Amino acid sequence: ARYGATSTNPAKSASARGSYLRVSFKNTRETAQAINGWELTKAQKYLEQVLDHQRAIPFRRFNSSIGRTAQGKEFGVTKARWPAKSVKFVQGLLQNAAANAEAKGLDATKLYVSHIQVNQAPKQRRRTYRAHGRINKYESSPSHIELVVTEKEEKVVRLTSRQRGRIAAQKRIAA
Amino acid sequence: LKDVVTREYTINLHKRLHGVSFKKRAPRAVKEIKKFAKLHMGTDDVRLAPELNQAIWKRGVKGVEYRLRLRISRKRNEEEDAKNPLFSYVEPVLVASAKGLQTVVVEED
Amino acid sequence: ANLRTQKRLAASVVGVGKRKVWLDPNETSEIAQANSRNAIRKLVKNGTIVKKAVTVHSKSRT
RNA sequence: CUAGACCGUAAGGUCGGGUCGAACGGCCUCUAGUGCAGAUCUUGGUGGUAGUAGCAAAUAUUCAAAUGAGAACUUUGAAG
Ligand SMILES: [Mg+2]
Ligand SMILES: [Mg+2]
Ligand SMILES: [Mg+2]
Ligand SMILES: [Mg+2]
Ligand SMILES: [Mg+2]
Ligand SMILES: [Mg+2]
Ligand SMILES: [Mg+2]
Ligand SMILES: [Mg+2]
Ligand SMILES: [Mg+2]
Ligand SMILES: [Mg+2]
């Protein structure tokens, strides 16, 4: 309960969550944005193609000094990747949400991802060992993920005295 | 057509391993026969007989034969099948030389 | 299965190195149950674990 | 907390809504460990850099089977 800001019918919606999942937040954010708004079966088929390296996930925000790929032409970008670990976490939650929709009684052919949001989980700490006896952090960036599927849904005017007189003068000569 | 079939192929491993670094000629010869059986049977799942692995690795990581006679059998995938229903099982054929042989269909009966 | 323990046991029982110990890959369940030196000894005599003869080093050229 | 309202030149004061759950204000005086943007200030927390620099010494791995939700890395066999 207490998801992000959603504007849909809760009675016509099914939800899913995953917290503290040790998957890159930056890569999960782009995977989430690549299916935000899509139809459920289209989103699930697309993520399977990302696992097969046929289609890519467009990297829009966390993408500085990423390599270029041809498979970004589908979305108008040069930089796109295939975050397999991020995809598996997302499609696990999509499968859970479709299970909730089936349990709730929701009609699966009309489902679509209405809200998907990836947040930063608390980081997991490790050390790394540097030159000249230095120690730096070596830290994971886990993801809080939450998504919701929904069915696709199918003046006193004020006038002055001279304004009313003109409207009166228009009407008494109109045919 | 006939989804189950077995055929004799000669692979020119010389032209496929040309210019490849010595420590991965035999591993790459494994991958070339995998791409070879996929290009001739249309199956993603390619399985290599361990005796075929012996034939690839016979002269070390560096001495893969220039030519190699293969028997590629496309069979029906079972036992909790994967995304594909057919697979390729590649066997070695023991011949005196691997030169002068064309592709021939070998009958199951 | 983790037959690492059985391969260690078979080497010490037979008296050779682990590199000369053969465990039947078709009899994994039987070797797995053998946890004692007496059970590895029983596996040696019924052929499940064999001694894997030495690599020759000829002196013909010498 | 609040691109909602009001008062004061200002320091500030007051109100509405949301959240919350147990104490807190106005006025006349008393008192101070009483007001922060800086001090390579102190402690803690968080950024951009950035999914980046990199994870390249020690010749080298491969095939099948088993187990498993999942096997480049586990086990066994074969090979090198
Ligand atoms: Mg740049
Ligand atoms: Mg670079
Ligand atoms: Mg780049
Ligand atoms: Mg270091
Ligand atoms: Mg060269
Ligand atoms: Mg209370
Ligand atoms: Mg003070
Ligand atoms: Mg300050
Ligand atoms: Mg890099
Ligand atoms: Mg090395």
UniProtKB/Swiss-Prot annotation, chain A:
Localisation: Cytoplasm
Keywords annotated in UniProt: Cytoplasm, Isopeptide bond, Phosphoprotein, Ribonucleoprotein, Ribosomal protein, Ubl conjugation
Pfam families (alphabetical): Ribosomal_L22 (PF00237)
GO CC terms: cytoplasm; cytosol; cytosolic large ribosomal subunit; preribosome, large subunit precursor
A molecular function (GO) term: structural constituent of ribosome
Subcellular location, principal: cytoplasm
Membrane spanning stretches: none
SUPFAM superfamilies, A to Z: Ribosomal protein L22
Glycyl lysine isopeptide (Lys-Gly) (interchain with G-Cter in ubiquitin) crosslink location in chain: 45
Known function: Component of the ribosome, a large ribonucleoprotein complex responsible for the synthesis of proteins in the cell. The small ribosomal subunit (SSU) binds messenger RNAs (mRNAs) and translates the encoded message by selecting cognate aminoacyl-transfer RNA (tRNA) molecules. The large subunit (LSU) contains the ribosomal catalytic site termed the peptidyl transferase center (PTC), which catalyzes the formation of peptide bonds, thereby polymerizing the amino acids delivered by tRNAs into a polypeptide chain.
Miscellaneous comment in the UniProt entry for this protein: There are 2 genes for uL22 in yeast.
Family membership: Belongs to the universal ribosomal protein uL22 family.
Protein name listed in UniProt: Large ribosomal subunit protein uL22A
Source species: Saccharomyces cerevisiae (strain ATCC 204508 / S288c)
From Swiss-Prot, chain B:
Domain of life assignment: Eukaryota
GO cellular component: cytosol; cytosolic large ribosomal subunit
GO molecular function: structural constituent of ribosome
Pfam families according to UniProt: Ribosomal_L31e
This protein's record includes keyword Disulfide bond: no
InterPro entries: Ribosomal_eL31 (IPR000054), Ribosomal_eL31_CS (IPR020052), Ribosomal_eL31_dom_sf (IPR023621)
Further details from the record: There are 2 genes for eL31 in yeast.
Subunit description: Component of the large ribosomal subunit (LSU). Mature yeast ribosomes consist of a small (40S) and a large (60S) subunit. The 40S small subunit contains 1 molecule of ribosomal RNA (18S rRNA) and 33 different proteins (encoded by 57 genes). The large 60S subunit contains 3 rRNA molecules (25S, 5.8S and 5S rRNA) and 46 different proteins (encoded by 81 genes).
Family the UniProt entry places it in: Belongs to the eukaryotic ribosomal protein eL31 family.
Protein name per UniProt: Large ribosomal subunit protein eL31A
Organism of this sequence: Saccharomyces cerevisiae (strain ATCC 204508 / S288c)
Gene responsible for this protein: RPL31A
Curated annotation (Swiss-Prot), chain C:
Cross-link annotation Glycyl lysine isopeptide (Lys-Gly) (interchain with G-Cter in ubiquitin), location: 20, 52, 59
Miscellaneous comment: Present with 97700 molecules/cell in log phase SD medium. There are 2 genes for eL19 in yeast.
Shown segment, full-protein numbering: 2 to 63 of 189
Taxonomic lineage of the native organism: Eukaryota, Fungi, Dikarya, Ascomycota, Saccharomycotina
Task performed by this protein: Component of the ribosome, a large ribonucleoprotein complex responsible for the synthesis of proteins in the cell. The small ribosomal subunit (SSU) binds messenger RNAs (mRNAs) and translates the encoded message by selecting cognate aminoacyl-transfer RNA (tRNA) molecules. The large subunit (LSU) contains the ribosomal catalytic site termed the peptidyl transferase center (PTC), which catalyzes the formation of peptide bonds, thereby polymerizing the amino acids delivered by tRNAs into a polypeptide chain.
Residue numbers of Phosphoserine PTMs: 29, 36
Naturally occurring in which organism (per UniProt): Saccharomyces cerevisiae (strain ATCC 204508 / S288c) (Baker's yeast)
Family from the record: Belongs to the eukaryotic ribosomal protein eL19 family.
Protein's recorded name: Large ribosomal subunit protein eL19A
Subunit structure: Component of the large ribosomal subunit (LSU). Mature yeast ribosomes consist of a small (40S) and a large (60S) subunit. The 40S small subunit contains 1 molecule of ribosomal RNA (18S rRNA) and 33 different proteins (encoded by 57 genes). The large 60S subunit contains 3 rRNA molecules (25S, 5.8S and 5S rRNA) and 46 different proteins (encoded by 81 genes). eL19 lies in close proximity to the binding site for eukaryotic initiation factor eIF4G.
Compartment(s) of residence: Cytoplasm
